[PDB]
């Protein structure tokens, strides 16, 4: 028993982290097959980041301007290209530690594990959710750019995130591994704001199911509700609207716990309207929304990976 | 910027997880050099766990009764011994993935990363603290026994925990890698209770320092206090007494933030006496005590590992 915010095992991703240096800027790169992926702003100076013309800046750069280092070995770069906001450097040797992998663009509300790295060296691993406003609340210091977020499916690493910027808000933005930013953000040091950050309702419901599974049943009320009345309540509290797709996704936990989804919705509505009165649920005094139903099922019956 | 409960990279530990089966019971083992370490209750039946004589039970067992499997390869066991509550099985091949490692017995209040495994396969990684009552609040399902907790110091894995039991409380107990339990717990299915679980005061102080570093300064008050008056307040709220050793340990963060330790103690005392009034600190509506000052320094200036 027990419920914890849990990240995937990170060894297969550790095997792919390298250090990319261009000019005086050093960040992290992802070395898969004979290609190293990294943020393109590796070619920027500190002054260039205020208003960068990435095409003109990249044109001043040649293959030998990019120093790629795996541990303490040096990779020879034989070509470079810019795919959206990512730089792809073709190297002479394919990574012998390349895992079976895929590039995926996750949906808002989905979760992934971030391997925070510095100078190409992994430093930590933690779980994150792509917020509805397409930011993430991470732990990223200077030099962490190029760190990646991923999911593991037994043997296959699905990379979904590469970290590019910290907004003046303190939250973080990044791209998929094809270089397309999540959200309306751009890789320049300018005033950028993420919109209203709503709460992932289906995730909170899955978390309440996990709580019930682990013995925390105090919030279970005598009420039920309708989907439309629940959404009425959800819009007042900045909760994303609940759909029948969400109900179907929650199906399995409802069958395991014997609690209909709309009864859980009524309990959540009472929680939103009257607070928690100084109590805790699964050791938290807030409603947690960074656990998908998939996460809950996986951690409540314990699936493993390669 | 940002602050997250963050675990160590787990690849070096993943390389050492094997599956140990005795009779009908299968759990996880730690394969270092030519020795596999596992909980001794691997030799117990479900009925034996109610009152086990481990010496008599182990005497009915021979080397060939222990099946050790690394991935899908089988290890030949050439000897077995019982060190306190751990079984040590000598195998014929030394683990080629053995990292530089140490066995350490951590102190209450210290933290470590747990690699939750099932059938010798790593499934997740999360950060835990050894509670003052020598339990941990983890996520452990059936088959998770033998999962290990560790710390990483650049190249060296310090193993400190092996998971043996879930108490009827729902919290978890285990041993060091020499087989000595943390706390007064024994490996039999009987009524076992952990004492009062106090809050690690120095950890909460480090967490408040981390919050100040990350821009959350609302709790900084106009008061200061004495160590003895602060402990007066701490004993009422089940906080472990603060010592001058704790003040010295907090020294560096006090120098970084410009906030004396006793002023932070006064702020924490006001928080304890008047609650949080529906506010949050670092995204939490409770006082967090699972971050050591070492964790805070590491995550606020970003040290890396091999």
Curated annotation (Swiss-Prot), chains A, B:
Effect of residue 142 to A: Does not affect ability to cleave and inactivate human TRMT1
Ways its activity is controlled: Inhibited by pyridone-containing alpha-ketoamides compounds 13a and 13b. In turn, alpha-ketoamide 13b (tert-butyl (1-((S)-1-(((S)-4-(benzylamino)-3,4-dioxo-1-((S)-2-oxopyrrolidin-3-yl)butan-2-yl)amino)-3-cyclopropyl-1-oxopropan-2-yl)-2-oxo-1,2-dihydropyridin-3-yl)carbamate) inhibits SARS-CoV-2 replication in human lung cells. Inhibited ex vivo by michael acceptor inhibitor N3. Inhibited ex vivo by compound 11a and 11b.
Domain Peptidase C30: 1-306
Residues in compartment: Cytoplasmic: 1-306
Catalytic activity, reaction form: TSAVLQ-|-SGFRK-NH2 and SGVTFQ-|-GKFKK the two peptides corresponding to the two self-cleavage sites of the SARS 3C-like proteinase are the two most reactive peptide substrates. The enzyme exhibits a strong preference for substrates containing Gln at P1 position and Leu at P2 position
Subcellular location: Host cytoplasm; Host Golgi apparatus; Host nucleus
Catalytic residues in the record: 41 (for 3cl-pro activity), 145 (nucleophile)
Domain of life: Viruses
Sites of the Glycyl lysine isopeptide (Lys-Gly) (interchain with G-Cter in ubiquitin) crosslink: 5, 90
Stated consequence of mutating residue 49 to A: Does not affect ability to cleave and inactivate human TRMT1
Result, substituting residue 189 to A: Does not affect ability to cleave and inactivate human TRMT1
Chain's role: Cleaves the C-terminus of replicase polyprotein at 11 sites. Recognizes substrates containing the core sequence [ILMVF]-Q-|-[SGACN]. Cleaves and inactivates human TRMT1, preventing tRNA guanine(26)-dimethylation of tRNAs. May cleave human NLRP1 in lung epithelial cells, thereby activating the NLRP1 inflammasome pathway. May cleave human GSDMD, triggering alternative GSDME-mediated epithelial cell death upon activation of the NLRP1 inflammasome, which may enhance the release interleukins 1B, 6, 16 and 18. Also able to bind an ADP-ribose-1''-phosphate (ADRP).
Subunit structure as annotated in this protein's UniProt entry: 3CL-PRO exists as monomer and homodimer. Only the homodimer shows catalytic activity. Interacts with host FBXO22; this interaction promotes the proteasomal degradation of nsp5.
Name of protein: 3C-like proteinase nsp5
Range within the parent protein: 3264 to 3569 of 7096
């Amino acid at each position: 028993s027990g419920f914890r915010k849990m990240a995937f095992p990170s060894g297969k991703v550790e095997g792919c982290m390298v250090q990319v240096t261009c000019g005086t800027t050093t960040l992290n790169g992802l070395w898969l097959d004979d290609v190293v992926y990294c943020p393109r702003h590796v070619i920027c100076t500190s002054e260039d980041m205020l208003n960068p013309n990435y095409e003109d800046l990249l044109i001043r750069k040649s293959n030998h301007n990019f120093l790629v280092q795996a541990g303490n070995v040096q990779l020879r770069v034989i070509g470079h290209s810019m795919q959206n906001c990512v730089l792809k450097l073709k190297v002479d040797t394919a990574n012998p530690k390349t895992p079976k992998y895929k590039f995926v663009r996750i949906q808002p509300g989905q979760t992934f594990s971030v391997l925070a790295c510095y100078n190409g060296s992994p430093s930590g691993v933690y779980q994150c959710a792509m917020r509805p406003n397409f930011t993430i609340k991470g732990s990223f210091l200077n030099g962490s750019c190029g760190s990646v977020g991923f999911n593991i499916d037994y043997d296959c690493v699905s990379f979904c995130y590469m970290h590019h910027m910290e907004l003046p808000t303190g939250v973080h933005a990044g791209t998929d591994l094809e270089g397309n930013f999540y959200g309306p953000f751009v890789d320049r040091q300018t005033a950028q704001a993420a919109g209203t950050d709503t709460t992932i309702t289906v995730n909170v419901l899955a978390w309440l199911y996990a709580a019930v599974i682990n013995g925390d049943r105090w919030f279970l009320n005598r009420f039920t509700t309708t989907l439309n009345d629940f959404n009425l309540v959800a819009m007042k509290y900045n909760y994303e609207p609940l759909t029948q797709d969400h109900v179907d996704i929650l199906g399995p936990l409802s069958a395991q716990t014997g609690i209909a989804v709309l009864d859980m919705c009524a309990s959540l509505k009472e929680l939103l309207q009257n607070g928690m009165n100084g109590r805790t649920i699964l050791g938290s005094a807030l409603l947690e929304d960074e656990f998908t139903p998939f996460d809950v099922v996986r951690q409540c019956s314990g699936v493993t990976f390669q």
